[PDB]
């Protein structure tokens, strides 16, 4: 069982960013702006800084060349500055690794610390970035399939009852899970910034990062997705969907970009900020909690998920 | 070969209605009125005359209750009476078995012909009918999922060329096919109103009707049907979909009835109306003619469809 | 009163183009290309040849740099090459004068028929056209305001019952209509395709052409078109809507080009083939006739529209 | 000028709902029920209790027979039982008039505190609330135009600086405001949920209540309440829209239910969560702040709005 901490929990806003490791810039600049049409804030030989349609800060995702394709920081903004400092001190009594640097280990993050967590995933909390153009109102940039915040991640570890705990005092509260009879929790979706989910913990080999998340205004945003990767001949990496989740009640869709990193784009979000919020809890059993339509299940969504990297950048174990 | 008569084909407008026969009315009703939001125009306990929302003649569906689950008649409005003659005359210099009816088969329609086609198939041509309230403006009616149009059949024969000469003699033109790298065609769609089709020939045992389908305005209707089959516990009735058809270019969903008729509804359209209009043929092996997105196979899609009745209400020996 | 010749009626198909001159040809395309999205089939230093999403001859749209801008043509296409014969009888036996190209007027149409018909407008009969690459399912270049079909034209004209007889000897079936107490006419809706309408007659001083019509898949393609327009700080060239029509059940929204031609941009149709097909006649003092919803009047919708020209390439006078 | 007391202020999580004195409680129940879709939680021959589509507390809005129609409360949830003290202590601190009812004002609210504010509001503050049927996927329930959140409160009063200190020191945060040239403010939207607005001050007359707001999960849903409007014959009650505000972003509607009360339903939203939100600043000059289409204005709009009561239940006086 992972303690809770004496010092206080650093107070975090919502899941802010992920930086990927990609083997080949140029085909994954294709897949990100070409195909999906995210905004670039920044780039270089080396990394592509990328935003949707209604973000202020930043960057939403940053795409770094690297040897391995992997997940190296999955990244929680935080209150206020002081929150970094709160959360160097969680993570240093729990006895994890953490780098902390003051201007930060991407470009337009400030302060900045990043930490191996008790689960192996690299997390990253900061508060301090660079604020850009928030592309909200530029109809005149607006593709049909328009990808418009960055929603979430979703975490396979193995032992998902020891890793709800942690997160729970963390501050992320559950929204959804699912459940057996002895009332063991087999996944979770949990949440800081008042959507169904910022992180999810889902049970298999790990650590490893089964997605990244970006929401689209409606439904049909999803569907021209699917007939613009017809279109280009790329539909062999739509992987899942469309469909309708029964857990968190989505109309989802899940591709794959070059190195297999899978991506979820997905629509319609319910409100959970109260704090009696009622959690849902579906049963292992329940068929609906996969797809509300009964959609036929694709394996791999069950096998594959990317691998994520330590703080020096090597891949970490998968138990 | 079926050989092209002298005597002139009538002129067919478009189809128009499905008498389908179903086992227990009160169940069906449940599907195609509460589930499906169809019109009634008229019922008893015997029959039930449904419209979609933007019909005015009296129906596109006449649910009858039978023994035996089958297709009794697919129905094709013609453009005059006199037509109705000059298919009697037209089906007789073919040798099929005919009936002819001064007041109708079903309430709603008057003179009207039924026969058995060459295929085996129980068409019915008609220009009599009775018009009812056009309910296009009737919102104070529109459902989430409202079904709006009925717009093709689709036929499993054995012997598409066969039938698709036949078909083009009587005036269908063919829009979208599938060929072999021979140039055989493997399957036509055909119409008259000037959508994709009116009628649809596809391989396999027959005859035997795989569906009928209707139209929603928009995606997001679709998408309703699904999501209501799923509050209502009757998604395991959702056979195949959603999906987007290569060819047709149609945003599909094919559910069952409860005597396990296979209902199409789907959306987008294009105009076919010009002579000219270039037929796209898509090559037998190329897996998007079925889905563009790559949607995996459902094998029932491919084993099940309608038996259908002749004229003395006899299931058609499926050859 | 326009007597019905003697010679019988081309057979008409729908409308298919309309030639509009405009005065600065770089500003047309800016609106028409880079704004709306139309796609290019050909163009110079003096025209541009346009297209929608799904069409396959060879253009929709020909602007044509002139003086002054006005309609040049509209165009309709007729079933077969000896329609073009048929409708060169026609209009001579009817007195109008009339010119014949067998290569055509504009690029990409072949034989083809002009004529100032007895009301004062510029139309073209021809059956010839270069065919070229259907869009339809080019997903990769489909724009969030996609216009995918052309529609039709509406003229304004001083007596609406003398031209309503002169387009239905020539074929057109009215759909709907307006009339006061008495029976009159005021405006009707007429069509060759089978949906509301190819031309529409509405009363006013003459010859004009009111606006040309083009459609979306979609109401959200509509807003979006809107919601560009407002990006590029372009919103007071959107004339009146969105909207709903009472007469023709549309989703509306029209917008003023560079040369304030009008262009309708709606969507939602519905079937009007059937010989029978109920005509619709609202009252003149019904309000929702014009918006369903009771949006403002918008005056400048009822006093302007675009000079026409005759073959000598002149306005023709406005009665 | 309105002085931040010592006294904490309590945590407001979210607006809750309004109680809305209406005439005649059968005709605001077919507006609200009939025609908009809402959901009866609770009710009787005095008092209907309605919710939206999403909502798992005991109501959105509480409609209540009186003899003149008015706001009676506006409620915001506060995030536990001890803020609603905080709540009592901080009006108090304020000079308030006070009202602290143990087990409520109006069934499924317990503890509660009504207040007399400083802009003259009848502001309720409760945490406690009858949790019932979140019907957020009952698919069979939905309606084409479902309402299905509580987003905001439009409030109109003299002084709008005073009023927006008073709300700041409360924590209300600014996301978008109107200034003029000195960077005076005339208008002002503030969030604690972290969408656009909970609340927003507006200038004119006041006490009065401008309009309460839900939203629908997309643009169609909004326009088929227009349509079902149109098709009952009650589009005279549409009074502004569908229209695309600047300020907001929002898709907008407004109508007005049968005491003359606003409602607006809307679609789109953004995230506001993050403490440093880039505040937009609208110029008062600029026309694209209330209409981003440029719609025409519609003075009843910046007129009327609705009176509210004391905790007497007398109106309060308009300055």
Not at 64 to 70: L, Q
Not at 191 to 202: P, S
Request: charged residues 25%; proline residues 5%; contains cysteine.
């Amino acid at each position: 069982e992972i303690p809770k901490p004496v010092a206080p929990a650093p107070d975090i806003l919502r899941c802010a960013y992920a930086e990927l490791v990609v083997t080949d810039l140029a085909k994954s600049r294709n897949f990100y702006v070409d195909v999906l049409g995210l905004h670039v804030s920044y780039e270089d030989e080396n990394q592509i800084y990328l935003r949707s349609f209604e973000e202020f800060i930043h960057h939403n995702l940053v795409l770094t060349k690297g040897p391995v394709a992997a997940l190296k920081a999955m990244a929680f903004r935080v209150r206020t500055p002081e929150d970094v400092d709160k959360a160097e001190a969680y993570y240093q009594e729990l006895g994890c690794r953490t780098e902390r640097r003051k201007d930060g280990f991407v470009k337009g993050i400030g302060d900045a610390l990043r930490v191996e967590d008790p689960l192996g995933f690299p997390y990253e909390f900061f508060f301090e970035t660079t604020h850009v153009e928030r592309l909200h109102m530029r109809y005149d940039l607006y593709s049909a399939g328009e990808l418009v915040r960055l929603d979430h991640f979703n975490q396979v570890t193995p032992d998902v009852p020891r890793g709800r705990k942690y997160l729970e005092d963390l501050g992320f509260r559950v929204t959804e899970d699912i459940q057996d009879d002895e009332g063991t929790t087999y996944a979770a979706w949990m949440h800081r910034k008042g959507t169904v989910h910022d992180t999810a913990l889902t049970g298999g080999n790990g650590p490893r990062l089964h997605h990244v998340a970006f929401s689209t205004h409606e439904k049909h945003n999803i569907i021209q997705i699917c007939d613009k990767m017809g279109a280009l001949r790329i539909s062999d990496r739509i992987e899942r969907g469309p469909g309708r989740h029964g857990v968190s009640n989505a109309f989802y869709l899940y591709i794959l970009d070059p190195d297999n990193h899978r991506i979820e784009i997905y629509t319609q979000d319910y409100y959970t900020g109260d704090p009696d919020n009622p959690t849902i809890t579906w049963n292992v059993h329940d068929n609906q909690r996969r797809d509300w339509w009964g959609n036929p299940v694709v394996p791999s969504w069950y096998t594959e998920a990317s691998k994520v990297l330590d703080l020096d950048g090597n891949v970490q174990e998968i138990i």
